[PDB]
Amino acid sequence: PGIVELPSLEDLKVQEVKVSSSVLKAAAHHYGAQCDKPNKEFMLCRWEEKDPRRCLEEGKLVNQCALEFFRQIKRHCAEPFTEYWTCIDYSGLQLFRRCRKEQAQFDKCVLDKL
């Protein structure tokens, strides 16, 4: 039949959000609340046209937005966030309910700073 189409490797290159899953899980709610617009645009397009080859620039944009959010986090409250994701990462199942004190500390620092 037809020769299948595939974008070149230069179109797929992007700066990566290189963090562990505990960093994502700790700041999941802030990431969901702050970066809703490019994430939801990417999700709408990805569910609409059903093609990852036509949904690449929006993935690029969502990577830049997530990296910008984390770079903003690193500038102000690096140490409470470090303690919070460490207390998340000790748990085997990564429970939210075992680190309510670091939850309050991170929430207070982020709310007062940003």
Binding site: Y90, S91, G92, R98
Partner: protein, 318 residues
């Protein structure tokens, strides 16, 4: 470093099996107005060692009229089934975390009967066949009620995972909202482990030695430690089900010591049950789990299906 973990699981359980034989002989001495073994060592601490060394220097004695393949295969299956029984037990971290551990215990409980059945069949004996058919009748008596009791209890847990059973009763004990289910569970595991008053397989009065009446030393010891590992892990299973302890993820030794004390007290109560009651018949047991336990269990299963819908207390499945 998984093989080190496996070895450090499988060696202490058989050491504790030998010392449970010691403790059982001492308690079975001390309740009946006498003493246990206290001559071999300091308060008889070397009796299981002497018993173990004695049983491995005696004659093997494979019978001529017995099919040798199944005769050798059955004790190996019994010991291996008792040894792989212990794997997903969380103390507080299991060796193998499994999504469905409860069904694995149920399937391996079904499989472990076949060692008794084939050891009875292979040894060409009438008493061995009698013990084998008594084991068959005992299994068809207890298995349905055991599975449905465990089903109607796990409905408040949300999943078959045993580690979730620690979290699901971290507020209050699970023996409170299922105390009747706890009693019938205890009776069902008394019947599962072939212990008194539901022995009915290794009967020393109705028969001489049951399905292992032809098994000489060595191979017979495999059935002995298989049965004692079975009773220890079944008490451990009951302790996890109904008597969950406080778990600190930073100090797991607290949960380990609490759990160990509770399971030891359960085994003490098990030997206490052993030295108190006459043995049932093997048809009176069939009229016990069917005419008395099964209708109440069906009613309790209706109750524990409707109750989470009733109180909006459906547990999470995650």
């Amino acid at each position: 470093m998984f093989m080190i973990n496996v070895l450090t699981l499988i060696i202490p359980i058989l050491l504790a099996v030998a010392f449970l034989t010691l403790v059982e002989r001492k308690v079975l001495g001390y309740m009946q107005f006498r003493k246990g073994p206290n001559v071999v060592g300091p308060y008889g601490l070397l009796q299981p060692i002497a018993d173990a060394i004695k049983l491995f220097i005696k004659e093997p004695l494979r019978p001529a009229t017995s099919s040798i393949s199944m005769f050798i295969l059955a004790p190996i299956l019994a010991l291996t089934l008792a040894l792989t029984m212990w794997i997903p037990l969380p103390m507080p971290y299991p060796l193998i975390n499994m999504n469905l551990g409860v069904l694995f215990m149920l399937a391996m409980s079904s499989l472990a009967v076949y060692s008794i059945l084939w050891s009875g069949w292979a040894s060409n004996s009438k008493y061995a066949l009698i013990g084998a058919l008594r084991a068959v009748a005992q299994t068809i008596s207890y298995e349905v009620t055991l599975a449905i009791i465990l089903l109607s209890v796990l409905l408040m847990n949300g999943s078959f995972t045993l580690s979730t059973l620690i979290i699901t009763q971290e507020q209050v004990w699970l023996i409170f909202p299922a105390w009747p289910l706890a009693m019938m569970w205890f009776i069902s595991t008394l019947a599962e482990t072939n212990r008194a008053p539901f022995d009915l397989t290794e009967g020393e009065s109705e028969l001489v030695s049951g399905f292992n009446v032809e098994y000489a030393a060595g191979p017979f010891a495999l059935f002995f430690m298989a049965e004692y590992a079975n009773i220890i892990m079944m008490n451990i299973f009951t302790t996890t089900l109904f008597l969950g302890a406080f778990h600190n993820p930073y100090m797991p030794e607290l949960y380990t010591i609490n759990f160990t004390i509770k399971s030891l007290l359960l085994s003490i109560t098990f030997l206490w049950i052993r030295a108190s009651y006459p043995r049932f018949r093997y048809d009176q047991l069939m009229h016990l789990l069917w005419k008395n336990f099964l209708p109440l269990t069906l009613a309790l299963c209706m109750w524990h299906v409707s109750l989470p819908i009733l109180l909006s207390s459906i547990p999470p499945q995650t």
